[PDB]
């Protein structure tokens, strides 16, 4: 009663569900249009994905010597920053950035 | 409660549920023919993210010599670029939240 | 022209298959607000909208190819070309005042 | 009586003339300064040139097999987009974009 | 949580050593103005602030190396990564309304 | 009805008709010495587009082994960059249409 | 008349005089804990410019075969990027001049 | 200085041939509105305006060369350097409030 | 009495001192915060450094034949432009750009 189910067609990853519900609960339930719900799937999927990439990054950072892959480490660092910046834009698009909600 | 997509614009069949969600997010009488064309591309992009994510997750499950790090990197970026484009497409159609709330 | 539209300027080279896109755009603001300059710009808008469908067909063909003949570089380039067309179209809509903010 | 001749020194291509006159007729004749007329030559030349590049592109796209030039196709696609974006800026500079005229 | 802060959302994966950064940020606007969405965003802010200190340690280690084993490329990349994190953090602060313009 | 260009700025001789067109597009008394320097570069750029287009068209007429696709690509871009610069130069001088209309 | 830096943020010891100068440039009661974290990075960057300039000047004094033009170029750019970042960091903290004057 | 201008600051290194550019710029806003900081900035503006003429001379020389000694790369680089100077000069004018919007 | 000493820790280069004092004298002495003084060191250092790089550039430009280094010439030209653009931002940050002072 205090949230909204994700649209099935949009492919919310199951592990993104706790992120999804946090975002839905950050503005009035009646202000979520069907279009907004589609966009919110991608926000939640991105927030989940940062945690996945950070795990990969930390794994690669623990490797020392010949098998260490500096290129992959560099790429993962950048991918995380790009996701973070995208998420800020996604929040603003949904009016769940702080300026709107606070 | 909705509008049929313009045939010439080539809405992908699996993009239909995305299409209808977007059409239902502003008043039916505010959809111009130009807007309907733009909305086909929005829906096609929203569908396509799901397609590229499926490809990405497949590549991520591959371990060892056949794993393709370059392809993984390229797919990650393609998804981000689609997402950013979709935000612009929503604003162009006035179905971003600032307009509809 | 039909009484609810405008013919495209011949010199601008509207593609035949772009015609249904053209008419959709023309019909999205008042007929009397289309200047001759705007009509030139609208040809390029319609041509771009058509061209996305053409590139998507090429892309889907390339995506169905598996094994040695698959061309990952071409697939990457087509994905980007479609996004660049889409973004250009948004600017072209705004330039013509047929984006939603203007019309709705 | 309803248009203006292009400045000879500016090098309007002859096939760009129908584009030129369309643009001149899109704001009041008395609002065309000599500076604007120079700028309008380049607008018209660019609008013509898109049609030229599209013809080249379509020619290259019809070629299949060993002689197909994917690099040239990619370059022409980008050149057309860059011209289109430039033309939007050129229209705004001349106040013949729709916001000004409509 | 302590009565002047908020627990981080477990699913977001706040790093243990990011906790003191987390609490500093939470305590920089009213507790009741933290939406669940904001709390997710704040995890990434805190994780980034921690990560700068980690990268700076790696950088300083590489800078102490002289001769054949010195890796100028890695040093260059780490310098840039730190600047990119710093710039991202400024955007993350503004998104949360904990930049100075909002709070002061 | 016009102003002589500052000699030190090196207005190209064939840029003169461009120069005078620009000078005549705002009040003569509003041309500061600084503006006159900037206007030399505007006129020189407007002339130079015509020069580069002549080179480009020459290269485009060449077919076969001597055709230089790289040079053609570079000239196309140089022209676009000049055009975009000219728009900025017009705005800097307040001879863009928004100012003069 | 000042505030201690948060230990977890890793203010470099030689950055301390920079830190205190920045803290003293707006009211003490307007420094939130979040601002104090951001100010550590500002001070660390201000210190680091001096470090990179020392390295740059050392490389510039080298003549002949051991001179490293690539390193010189990279250091020049790193300094400019730090400087630009610092301007953004000042604005974020409202210690740029527009805010404090 | 002549009574309608200001001497350049010696430490800033105004090029001798940049002097006529310098004086044109100084004379484009009130003498009393030139701060010492502005005078430093104006040295760089004048030096850039002079330098365009220098680069254009080099470019025209290279453009007259035909055959094996022609250096297309250098020609390309000089064209871009001139455009970058021109764009920088517009920003330098605005920074000094001697762009037309300010003065006219 | 009409200027301010630079903060020692900030590493103002000695040859940048005349630039420093010119900038300090371009707004009211009481409006220079300690933070502004740090920033002003980097402004002055950059203004000095343009003169240094121009000297290097002119030296390289006088070299003809096999020893001429076109890459270095290109890099120095760009470095000067980047410094100049940075200085404009540094002036605005300190409110000693003309819009603020005039």
Numbering used by the authors:
A (entry chain B), D (entry chain B), I (entry chain B): 23 to 124
B (entry chain C), F (entry chain C), G (entry chain C): 24 to 124
C (entry chain A), E (entry chain A), H (entry chain A): 21 to 124
Task: Please give sentences taken from the publication describing this entry.
Both systems encode a large terminase (TerL) protein, composed of a viral packaging ATPase domain and a nuclease domain, and a small terminase (TerS) protein, which recognises the cos or pac site between genome copies and, upon binding of DNA, recruits TerL to make an initiating DNA cut. Here, we reconstituted in vitro a cos packaging system based on bacteriophage HK97 and provided a detailed biochemical and structural description. Crystal structures of the large terminase and DNA-recruiting small terminase, a first for a biochemically defined cos system, reveal mechanistic similarities between cos and pac systems.
Of the 161 residues in each protein chain, residues 21–124 had well-resolved electron density. Two strong helix-breaking proline residues, P28 and P29, prevent an α1 helix from forming in the HK97 protein. The HK97 oligomer has a van der Waals outer diameter of roughly 85 Å, with an inner tunnel 55 Å long and 18 Å wide at its narrowest point. Residues K36, K37, R47, K77 and K81 form a positive belt around the outside of the complex. However, positive charges from R86, K96, K100, R107 and R114 also line the inner tunnel, which is solvent-exposed and almost wide enough to accommodate double-stranded DNA.
